[PDB]
Amino acid sequence: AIDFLVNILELIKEKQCNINLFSAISLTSIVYNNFGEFLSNNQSYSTNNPLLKYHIIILNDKNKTKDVEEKRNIFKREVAELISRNFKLDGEKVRNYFDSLKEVLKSLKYTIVDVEITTRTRALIGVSTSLGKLIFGSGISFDPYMNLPYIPASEIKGIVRSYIEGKLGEQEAEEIFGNEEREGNVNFTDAYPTRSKDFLFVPDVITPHYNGKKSEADAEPRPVIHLTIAPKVTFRFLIYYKREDVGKPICDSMPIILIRGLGARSSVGYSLFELRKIEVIKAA
Amino acid sequence: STQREYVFIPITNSITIDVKITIGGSDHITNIDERGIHNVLVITGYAVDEKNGRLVPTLDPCDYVKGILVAGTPQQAQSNDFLTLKLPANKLYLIRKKGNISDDLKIYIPYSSPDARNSMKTKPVSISDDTIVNNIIKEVFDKIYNITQKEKVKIEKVKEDIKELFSYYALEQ
Amino acid sequence: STQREYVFIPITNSITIDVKITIGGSDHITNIDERGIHNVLVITGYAVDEKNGRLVPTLDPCDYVKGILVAGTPQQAQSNDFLTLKLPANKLYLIRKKGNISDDLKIYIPYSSPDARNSMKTKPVSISDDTIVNNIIKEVFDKIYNITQKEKVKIEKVKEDIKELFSYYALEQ
Amino acid sequence: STQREYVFIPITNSITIDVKITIGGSDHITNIDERGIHNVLVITGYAVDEKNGRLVPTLDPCDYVKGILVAGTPQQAQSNDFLTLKLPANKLYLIRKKGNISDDLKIYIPYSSPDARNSMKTKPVSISDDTIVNNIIKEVFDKIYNITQKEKVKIEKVKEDIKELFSYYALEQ
Amino acid sequence: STQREYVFIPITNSITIDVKITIGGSDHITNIDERGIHNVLVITGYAVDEKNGRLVPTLDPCDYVKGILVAGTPQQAQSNDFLTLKLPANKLYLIRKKGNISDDLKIYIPYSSPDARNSMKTKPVSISDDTIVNNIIKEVFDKIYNITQKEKVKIEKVKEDIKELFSYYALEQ
Amino acid sequence: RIIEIDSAKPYVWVYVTTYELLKKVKLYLDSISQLSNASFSNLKNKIDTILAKEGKNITLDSDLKSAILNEDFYVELEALNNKIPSIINAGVPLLVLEDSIGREVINRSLIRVRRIRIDRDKKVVETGGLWSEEYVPMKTIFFSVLLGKESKESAIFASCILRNLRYVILGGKETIGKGIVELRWVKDVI
Amino acid sequence: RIIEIDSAKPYVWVYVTTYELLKKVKLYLDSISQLSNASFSNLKNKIDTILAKEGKNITLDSDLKSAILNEDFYVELEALNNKIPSIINAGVPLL
Amino acid sequence: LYEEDYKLALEAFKKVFNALTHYGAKQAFRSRARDLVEEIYNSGFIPTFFYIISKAELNSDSLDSLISLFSSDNAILRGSDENVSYSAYLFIILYYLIKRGIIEQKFLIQALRCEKTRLDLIDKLYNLAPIISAKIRTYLLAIKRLSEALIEAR
Amino acid sequence: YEEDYKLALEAFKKVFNALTHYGAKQAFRSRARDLVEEIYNSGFIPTFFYIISKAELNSDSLDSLISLFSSDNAILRGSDENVSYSAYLFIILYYLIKRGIIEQKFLIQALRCEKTRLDLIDKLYNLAPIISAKIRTYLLAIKRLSEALIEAR
Amino acid sequence: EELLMSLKLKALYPLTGGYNRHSINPFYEELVRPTEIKGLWRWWNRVLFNTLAYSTKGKLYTYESIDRLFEDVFGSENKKSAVRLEVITDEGNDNRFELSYVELDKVIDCLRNYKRKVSLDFIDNTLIAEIEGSTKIPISFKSNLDIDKIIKDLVHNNKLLSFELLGFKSVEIDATKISDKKILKEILRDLITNYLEYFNIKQEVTFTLNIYLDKSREHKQNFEDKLKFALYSLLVFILLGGIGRKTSRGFGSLSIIDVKCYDNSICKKIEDLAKNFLKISSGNELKSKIESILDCIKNSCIDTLYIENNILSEIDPKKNVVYFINSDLFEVKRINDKEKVLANIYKAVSSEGCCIKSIITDKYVRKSFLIAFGGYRKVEKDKGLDIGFIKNYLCETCETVSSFNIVDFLLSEGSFMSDYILQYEHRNSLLRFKLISDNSNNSYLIGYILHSSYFKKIDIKYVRCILEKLTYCVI
């Protein structure tokens, strides 16, 4: 109901890890996109309500409209600050998850490689996925049922493989990761955050001036607020296999590949990681 | 064919009945039987002047007046109070519609001329001030509310239906 | 502003034959300099009827009309087929807006009234037939602005706007 | 042998008959009886030039001149214009095909030179404007056969096929 | 602009270029630079017929002739061997496009009067016969491009393009 | 995934089923009970109480009044009596939506992920190397039956094999961590 | 599978049969009612009541007036004259 | 009668495809149709629907042209290449809600035009949510395939 | 009768040659098996939109098809996905030409310039139940020549 | 992949922004954004390239094609970047902006039933809520970031910085209608944060700029040559431009502390030319080095100069604008109070400051000079002849006493440049300043004028000794 959406922003700041952030952001986007409309005479707002602020505040006088589009830019920046400040990582359900999974894979007689990577600089994984896409224009790989950002196992497997295929040639890669006529010999798991220092998400901006611009005349900044993963956030994931044959080239490659990019916009040094720990549980 | 008139639910009361609300046939489009007012007609580009509460045609499409449709004779004496349209019942903008109606109709709506002496500055009015959210709620209904004496005692929801739908625009000159 | 006049483009043009006394001052607002017609003013809820065509009102918000709003007179001081409203230019639903205008006008729009023994049965109409857009650039777009049309008639982009913009919902009775 | 010539359906008037007396024989290419018009010829890569309904060769495959190629020779006058083309009738793109042609068909087409004065930017001309829709039948269709406008209640369909079948391009310059 | 001419590529040496000197500017259209031939123009409704091939104008859209567009002049003022139209290059049906072309170009197209006295009866012809593609290379693809194939290393990658791309139609008399 | 107000207990996601989905589970238990000796009256009982509330969106295992499921469907949830025990045997609640609503909610509840292929040299996305797959979330529950025939070896298959069988890998995408699943025999989690 | 348009009582699926399928059931019933004393009037009269309304899409135990069957096929259903007691007993209607 | 989603998609496409004039506007609309159908699944129809109305930047004239497109044929979507693309894909969605009789056309235009009934539209969309969701995502899949065919790539 | 098995021989012969690369061959072999069953399950119009979209017919590929109607040395350009879908699209149009379901002149001027492609698809939609009845044996023949003359991958 | 080179630089009073337009925010702090370096490096590449193209071909090329030419180095929509930057700023902390407490609830009570506008001012280590309705009530806050005293001085004493505070300092508050305190206490609370964060300014921000190469970019056409030209555009970026905001006025000016390299085969001349700035020792000695670096990119050591390629595109002067380096307008003075000249530059760029009210001593030749050189100026064409009498200086061709003619600036009508040079609120300033030094304590102000393309022609020596007297009274 419309009585449900006007209260959605208060729900974020009162739970801080317990709303469905995926659905909460999507519902917020209905307000961010009807911002001018939700401001007309839509009272019955609580004291906690964060939309009164844009009734009281005022930025332009000659234009009803130009007063609003400025308020909407602030509202977006404010929303990005709510998410990053309130929604903070609780990594106990992940540790219980990975410890339960790791016991399962031992039952199945795999050799597990527990890996913790730590975010060094503000990371951007899944920038083209759908989380804040309807608000920020960018996204983050988000697991709406673990209610956490994550790094897809397909991405880690695809990054590691490009480093072995580049280093150890082609035939060695397709002997570890297979091809259209051999199965791969290494499985990966998604990487979930298990511990942060203070924050989990963090606002950022990209302001292109000269992109697809012919000259200096067509240049003008287009600021793009968005969310990134905060620094000093530890992502845990698993690597398991059956042939000891493939154990060495993975434990070797891992530390090198993390210090380079592991996500989007790493040419300008955003998603750089840090091997925090490697645990190797041999099968038998 | 049956002819109908158009009364609404304003904050004002200048439309008391203004009409013989019955045509000899008790048929009604704006049915309030099941779960609230249904088929309520919305008229676009008009204001009520909150005085002689007839409608002022305005070029702004964001002008907002809505009312109920009742079948009667349009006070044939005072033929200076309406404009007596005739639309095929598919060319008027209804709300909470019911089983469709696909045949021509004649409708009368309270119309007061521009009367150019000042400039129009229309403003929005909801329905509040419970002083009247009961009193003329009875009056305008009492043509169909003494029947509702069974539908208002135990099926009382339509007092909160007036609160939501009828949010017309009074010119407030 | 002054006494203002809204004329309609729809293709019979005998009611834009009925255009009358010009600016007097300089109140031409519908800019047509280079890109074509600007400050077009659309009326929603009406129809030109193209037969004694004088913008008969309706109730549908999906039918509309488009024309020109120029400094005029009530057709030789005949105030039966006009409304003569006054609005603060806040409620002026202009399209192809360019520049700005002050905040009060005396706009005259043609008027008619529903006559029974028929329905309304409104239908949309486009603009085509390049002879027609010669018939109106020569008649209804010229004897209102025949100071230009030595420079901006093959960089015209007004028929590019006539065919595009000036749709309407003729009665077609 | 079977002399034939091209006359098409533009808005222009120069296409009225544009070519002197028909073959005199009972043979034609296009039926007119049951489903309206049949076997409408479509020539690609030509435009009509908004006047003097002749076909200047363009190059793009988008330009159409849909018309009724009929039996006859051009104007019994200067042959400085028409194509004078012979083809086995399996090489002209007909639409709404009916009873099959089987012989070679020498045809004449209103050809103009490329006219390399300036750029040729074609303008798609759809057919509308009911007044000429009958005039087209009044100046073209009713004479080519004369079994129309005399004994046809099927005139109604000939009013519609023009606004449904023929649609072409024109330089307008 | 650049006055450009259209050297179609049939199997016959009826091309024998028989047109004038190169661009007079700096840019051809039918590039052969690195990915093969480029910007190959296509004409439709024409057959070359290779009896001094001059694209006899057919009307069957299924007849086409490909070929190259190089800038030249129509054979020392003999402006009747061609068509000489002037078009805005938006209508240029081009193949294997490589880059932009501007808003106005002159195109000279080897043209023949409609070859009457015969029904067209044209049939498709491809390009084969390595003796001919070897000829065609030195005949036009080297006489007009005796600066390529030398800054270019691989040449026999684009030789088969003539066999692959340049199909056409002809009356086959 | 769920968003709701008016709850002393917040939930990020909920279990969702429909009445058509429980019928097919009842249908499975009805027939195999008549085609064999095994009669699982306890499951049949729990499901019969739930099926008697058909036509209304009910809420087991919790006290939600109304929520928005998958960002798009606002449902008002009646509360089936709290004493109908859990069938998932867990702590999260379980909605049973009427099948017109639940067919939209369940379909949008699947995870849908776009993957790409990278140009090895340009380090950019290939041409036509972008596709999308569909996963079913973690902790989804599927119901099936495994039937046998008197064979002197169906006895061993049920005695020893089926007991020592808890974790299995199903389906594809195994090397990106998908497919691991757990088998929970009704015989011991009835 | 059905899309329950022109109604507010929602079904997810529905039973669909045709008239030629019923004629083959009438034939099976007419024949074996002669090769045996057993009669099936309760079934033979349901089927024959349905077959009277041939040349029209009908729904037996429903009020639908419209539907989109198997995502593609629009049907304008005319409910049966009065009712038929659910040949195949189930809450789901039969078209 | 009743048009199947593939016939409803052809009708809606040949109106948009003709209203768009600059090929840069069509190449944008090709990007819209490709990923806006994947966004409707991931973030629901209602959030994505108003996202489109915002990215359309419905100015007084742009909204005016969009309304003309429902009735006239000479209507031409004019604006920036990314505005008219989202403005075109809004017509695609509106052409479905209107023709399937899901939402009345008057209420829809009055929603986009005036701000007061816009909030009321947000409500109708939450009641009609199971109606729209079941169907629309295969009519939009036809619009996606029609654009990948009739519009050259990026 | 077996006219459609002869027609499927002429068509497959054109495709088998216009597909130069052998990996483009093995892709058309994939299309021939999948796209015949999808017209069975899903219907003609859904499958045609699917085909015509993965074909990516700009104008460069339209000429290759239009020429292939007439010449026997035209060649499809693109990658295994695009050429195979473009080949199968020609396989279909070849049948509607050689069976009078569409006027070849119309189909060729429809494929050519700008917008009569929409007219074609509009027309093809009105003939959908006729086509999906007549092409069954033809596409099934194409499916078997493909599995016979083209090796697997 | 391998490390190409490393550039230990420093920035002088950088005004690096962020999502809140400040260098610090409630979540983190970045005094150096590696995204701005990559963005400015590309901007100083499209400038240097068009300089190499207006000295050997007399041609100018659009931006969308120069980067298309260099996309095999910096990357584009079709290719990932070949170089990847990595800034490691020193002190490597978290250091977010935390506002411990802000005791303000009287100003709340001063704001009921009224539409005033709060305004913040930092008067003597204490801030005041200047309610323009005459209430300069104080506030007792307590936060991080330790605004020492100097920035409070430096901000208030610099007319440019204080002018840009006019956004971050004040906001109206409507309260005639329904009001609150929990809502007003949060409006005013962020107004403080967005104000104090403007004071996280620091001189001497020392950071490193590691630049990596991938060793997987096969030499397409001039990779080994395109790359080593980009390094040149990076040095001139360091030596002529700065990072952050208002770099056209000296802020964020970059220096060089020590340059290493790790691939001699490419960086050879670059590190050497960069080595020549660690020990600058004389004003006009650097004026030689500024020209020494520049000419080695011109006719001397011509880095493969392959302009004969079908990627470029000549500009249209009546509809395009391009900035390139005029090797002549360059001036290296000496300074010993960075803060003074940093605040003095306002005297040289304002239409009333006491440096161009002396050099260009009138109204019109003064303003019209700035209109064409001082970036975009707010000129209100509602007054009398002072839109045309400044136009009369900026016409394409008319009666000119000073050479400030614009390529298609016509009178009696407006062309594309006529509006651009007059109404386009984002136009960089051709007149620029930069303070540079390291290891010598000898700060040298640098002044120059970027050569644009919209200029019909400029009298070099005249506008040079305008710039000459400029750089003189700026100290």
Side-chain angles (χ1 to χ4, degrees), chain H residues 70-98:
Chain H
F70 272 111
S71 64
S72 179
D73 279 291
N74 308 105
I76 286 176
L77 300 191
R78 196 192 301 280
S80 159
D81 288 331
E82 303 282 16
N83 286 331
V84 307
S85 72
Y86 281 103
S87 178
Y89 207 73
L90 170 71
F91 174 83
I92 293 305
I93 285 181
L94 291 185
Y95 195 84
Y96 191 75
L97 302 184
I98 285 162

Short mmCIF file of all heavy atoms in Angstrom, two decimals, chain H residues 70-98:
data_model
loop_
_atom_site.label_atom_id
_atom_site.label_comp_id
_atom_site.label_asym_id
_atom_site.label_seq_id
_atom_site.Cartn_x
_atom_site.Cartn_y
_atom_site.Cartn_z
N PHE H 70 -0.73 7.40 -29.18
CA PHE H 70 -1.79 6.42 -28.96
C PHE H 70 -2.86 6.49 -30.02
O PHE H 70 -3.48 5.47 -30.35
CB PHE H 70 -2.41 6.62 -27.58
CG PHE H 70 -1.71 5.87 -26.49
CD1 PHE H 70 -1.00 6.54 -25.51
CD2 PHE H 70 -1.75 4.49 -26.45
CE1 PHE H 70 -0.35 5.86 -24.52
CE2 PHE H 70 -1.10 3.80 -25.45
CZ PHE H 70 -0.40 4.48 -24.49
N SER H 71 -3.10 7.68 -30.58
CA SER H 71 -4.19 7.90 -31.52
C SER H 71 -3.69 8.24 -32.91
O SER H 71 -4.04 7.56 -33.88
CB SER H 71 -5.10 9.01 -30.99
OG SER H 71 -4.40 10.24 -30.93
N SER H 72 -2.87 9.27 -33.04
CA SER H 72 -2.42 9.73 -34.35
C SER H 72 -1.34 8.79 -34.88
O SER H 72 -1.01 7.76 -34.27
CB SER H 72 -1.92 11.17 -34.26
OG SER H 72 -1.44 11.63 -35.51
N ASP H 73 -0.77 9.13 -36.04
CA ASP H 73 0.33 8.36 -36.59
C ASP H 73 1.50 9.28 -36.89
O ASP H 73 2.66 8.86 -36.87
CB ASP H 73 -0.11 7.62 -37.86
CG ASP H 73 -0.84 6.33 -37.55
OD1 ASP H 73 -0.19 5.38 -37.04
OD2 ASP H 73 -2.06 6.26 -37.80
N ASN H 74 1.21 10.55 -37.16
CA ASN H 74 2.26 11.54 -37.37
C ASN H 74 2.97 11.92 -36.08
O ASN H 74 3.92 12.70 -36.13
CB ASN H 74 1.68 12.80 -38.01
CG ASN H 74 0.88 12.51 -39.26
OD1 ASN H 74 -0.35 12.55 -39.24
ND2 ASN H 74 1.57 12.21 -40.35
N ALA H 75 2.53 11.39 -34.94
CA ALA H 75 3.20 11.68 -33.68
C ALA H 75 4.64 11.19 -33.72
O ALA H 75 4.93 10.09 -34.19
CB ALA H 75 2.46 11.03 -32.51
N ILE H 76 5.55 12.03 -33.23
CA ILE H 76 6.98 11.75 -33.28
C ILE H 76 7.57 12.02 -31.90
O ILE H 76 7.46 13.14 -31.39
CB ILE H 76 7.70 12.59 -34.34
CG1 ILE H 76 7.39 12.05 -35.74
CG2 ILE H 76 9.19 12.61 -34.09
CD1 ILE H 76 7.98 12.88 -36.84
N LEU H 77 8.18 11.00 -31.31
CA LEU H 77 8.87 11.17 -30.04
C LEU H 77 10.11 12.03 -30.24
O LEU H 77 11.02 11.65 -30.98
CB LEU H 77 9.24 9.81 -29.46
CG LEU H 77 8.06 8.88 -29.18
CD1 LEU H 77 8.50 7.69 -28.38
CD2 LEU H 77 6.97 9.64 -28.46
N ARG H 78 10.15 13.18 -29.59
CA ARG H 78 11.23 14.14 -29.74
C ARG H 78 11.88 14.42 -28.40
O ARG H 78 11.19 14.59 -27.39
CB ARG H 78 10.73 15.44 -30.36
CG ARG H 78 11.82 16.33 -30.92
CD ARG H 78 11.29 17.72 -31.24
NE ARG H 78 10.19 17.68 -32.21
CZ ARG H 78 10.36 17.56 -33.52
NH1 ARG H 78 11.57 17.46 -34.04
NH2 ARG H 78 9.30 17.54 -34.32
N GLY H 79 13.21 14.46 -28.39
CA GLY H 79 13.95 14.72 -27.17
C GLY H 79 15.37 14.18 -27.31
O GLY H 79 15.85 13.96 -28.41
N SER H 80 16.01 13.97 -26.16
CA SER H 80 17.31 13.34 -26.17
C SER H 80 17.18 11.87 -26.58
O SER H 80 16.09 11.29 -26.55
CB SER H 80 17.98 13.45 -24.80
OG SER H 80 18.98 12.47 -24.64
N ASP H 81 18.30 11.26 -26.95
CA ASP H 81 18.25 9.89 -27.43
C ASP H 81 17.95 8.91 -26.32
O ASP H 81 17.33 7.87 -26.56
CB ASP H 81 19.55 9.51 -28.13
CG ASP H 81 19.71 10.18 -29.47
OD1 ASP H 81 18.68 10.48 -30.11
OD2 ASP H 81 20.86 10.41 -29.90
N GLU H 82 18.37 9.21 -25.09
CA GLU H 82 18.03 8.35 -23.97
C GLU H 82 16.69 8.69 -23.36
O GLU H 82 16.07 7.82 -22.74
CB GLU H 82 19.12 8.41 -22.90
CG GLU H 82 20.51 8.04 -23.40
CD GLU H 82 20.71 6.54 -23.56
OE1 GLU H 82 19.72 5.79 -23.57
OE2 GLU H 82 21.88 6.10 -23.67
N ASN H 83 16.21 9.92 -23.52
CA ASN H 83 14.88 10.25 -23.03
C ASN H 83 13.81 9.58 -23.87
O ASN H 83 12.91 8.92 -23.34
CB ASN H 83 14.69 11.76 -23.00
CG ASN H 83 15.46 12.42 -21.88
OD1 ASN H 83 15.69 11.83 -20.83
ND2 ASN H 83 15.86 13.66 -22.10
N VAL H 84 13.88 9.74 -25.19
CA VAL H 84 12.83 9.19 -26.05
C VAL H 84 12.85 7.67 -26.03
O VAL H 84 11.81 7.03 -26.22
CB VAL H 84 12.95 9.74 -27.48
CG1 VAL H 84 13.00 11.24 -27.45
CG2 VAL H 84 14.18 9.18 -28.16
N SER H 85 14.02 7.06 -25.81
CA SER H 85 14.06 5.61 -25.70
C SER H 85 13.22 5.14 -24.52
O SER H 85 12.32 4.31 -24.67
CB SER H 85 15.50 5.13 -25.56
OG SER H 85 16.02 5.46 -24.29
N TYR H 86 13.51 5.67 -23.33
CA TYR H 86 12.68 5.36 -22.18
C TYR H 86 11.26 5.85 -22.37
O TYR H 86 10.32 5.27 -21.81
CB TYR H 86 13.28 5.97 -20.92
CG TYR H 86 14.44 5.21 -20.34
CD1 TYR H 86 15.74 5.65 -20.52
CD2 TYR H 86 14.24 4.06 -19.60
CE1 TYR H 86 16.80 4.97 -19.99
CE2 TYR H 86 15.29 3.38 -19.07
CZ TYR H 86 16.57 3.84 -19.26
OH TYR H 86 17.64 3.15 -18.73
N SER H 87 11.07 6.92 -23.14
CA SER H 87 9.72 7.37 -23.44
C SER H 87 9.02 6.40 -24.38
O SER H 87 7.81 6.21 -24.28
CB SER H 87 9.77 8.77 -24.06
OG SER H 87 8.47 9.21 -24.41
N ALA H 88 9.77 5.78 -25.29
CA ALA H 88 9.19 4.78 -26.16
C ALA H 88 8.85 3.51 -25.40
O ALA H 88 7.76 2.95 -25.56
CB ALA H 88 10.14 4.47 -27.31
N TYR H 89 9.76 3.04 -24.55
CA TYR H 89 9.48 1.84 -23.78
C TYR H 89 8.39 2.06 -22.75
O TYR H 89 7.80 1.08 -22.28
CB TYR H 89 10.74 1.34 -23.08
CG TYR H 89 10.70 -0.14 -22.85
CD1 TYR H 89 10.86 -1.02 -23.89
CD2 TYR H 89 10.48 -0.65 -21.59
CE1 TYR H 89 10.82 -2.37 -23.68
CE2 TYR H 89 10.44 -2.00 -21.37
CZ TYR H 89 10.61 -2.85 -22.42
OH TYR H 89 10.58 -4.21 -22.22
N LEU H 90 8.11 3.30 -22.37
CA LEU H 90 6.95 3.57 -21.55
C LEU H 90 5.67 3.38 -22.35
O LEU H 90 4.69 2.83 -21.84
CB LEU H 90 7.02 4.99 -20.99
CG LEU H 90 5.76 5.52 -20.31
CD1 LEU H 90 5.55 4.81 -19.00
CD2 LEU H 90 5.88 7.01 -20.10
N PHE H 91 5.67 3.81 -23.62
CA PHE H 91 4.51 3.56 -24.47
C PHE H 91 4.28 2.07 -24.66
O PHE H 91 3.13 1.61 -24.67
CB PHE H 91 4.69 4.25 -25.82
CG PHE H 91 3.60 3.93 -26.79
CD1 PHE H 91 2.42 4.64 -26.77
CD2 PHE H 91 3.76 2.93 -27.73
CE1 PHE H 91 1.41 4.35 -27.66
CE2 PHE H 91 2.76 2.64 -28.62
CZ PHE H 91 1.58 3.34 -28.58
N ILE H 92 5.35 1.30 -24.82
CA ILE H 92 5.22 -0.14 -24.95
C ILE H 92 4.47 -0.72 -23.76
O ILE H 92 3.56 -1.54 -23.91
CB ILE H 92 6.61 -0.79 -25.12
CG1 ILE H 92 7.23 -0.37 -26.44
CG2 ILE H 92 6.51 -2.29 -25.04
CD1 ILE H 92 6.37 -0.67 -27.61
N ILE H 93 4.85 -0.29 -22.56
CA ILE H 93 4.20 -0.81 -21.36
C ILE H 93 2.78 -0.28 -21.25
O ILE H 93 1.86 -1.02 -20.89
CB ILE H 93 5.04 -0.45 -20.12
CG1 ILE H 93 6.27 -1.36 -20.05
CG2 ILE H 93 4.22 -0.59 -18.87
CD1 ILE H 93 7.14 -1.10 -18.86
N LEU H 94 2.57 0.99 -21.58
CA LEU H 94 1.22 1.55 -21.51
C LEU H 94 0.31 0.93 -22.56
O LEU H 94 -0.87 0.70 -22.29
CB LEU H 94 1.27 3.06 -21.70
CG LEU H 94 1.90 3.87 -20.58
CD1 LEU H 94 1.76 5.34 -20.88
CD2 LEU H 94 1.25 3.52 -19.26
N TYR H 95 0.84 0.65 -23.75
CA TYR H 95 0.03 0.04 -24.79
C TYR H 95 -0.48 -1.33 -24.38
O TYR H 95 -1.51 -1.78 -24.88
CB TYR H 95 0.84 -0.07 -26.08
CG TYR H 95 0.02 -0.34 -27.31
CD1 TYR H 95 -0.59 0.69 -28.00
CD2 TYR H 95 -0.13 -1.63 -27.80
CE1 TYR H 95 -1.33 0.45 -29.13
CE2 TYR H 95 -0.87 -1.88 -28.92
CZ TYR H 95 -1.47 -0.84 -29.59
OH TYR H 95 -2.21 -1.09 -30.72
N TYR H 96 0.21 -1.99 -23.46
CA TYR H 96 -0.24 -3.28 -22.97
C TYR H 96 -1.32 -3.12 -21.92
O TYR H 96 -2.39 -3.73 -22.01
CB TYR H 96 0.93 -4.07 -22.41
CG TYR H 96 0.59 -5.50 -22.15
CD1 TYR H 96 0.47 -6.39 -23.19
CD2 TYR H 96 0.39 -5.96 -20.86
CE1 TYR H 96 0.16 -7.70 -22.96
CE2 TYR H 96 0.08 -7.28 -20.62
CZ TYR H 96 -0.03 -8.14 -21.68
OH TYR H 96 -0.34 -9.45 -21.49
N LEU H 97 -1.05 -2.31 -20.89
CA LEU H 97 -2.03 -2.09 -19.84
C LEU H 97 -3.35 -1.58 -20.39
O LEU H 97 -4.41 -1.90 -19.85
CB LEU H 97 -1.47 -1.10 -18.81
CG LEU H 97 -0.16 -1.51 -18.15
CD1 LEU H 97 0.25 -0.52 -17.08
CD2 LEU H 97 -0.29 -2.90 -17.56
N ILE H 98 -3.30 -0.80 -21.46
CA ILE H 98 -4.52 -0.23 -22.03
C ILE H 98 -5.28 -1.27 -22.84
O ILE H 98 -6.49 -1.45 -22.67
CB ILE H 98 -4.17 1.00 -22.88
CG1 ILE H 98 -3.84 2.17 -21.97
CG2 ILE H 98 -5.32 1.35 -23.80
CD1 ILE H 98 -3.09 3.26 -22.65
#
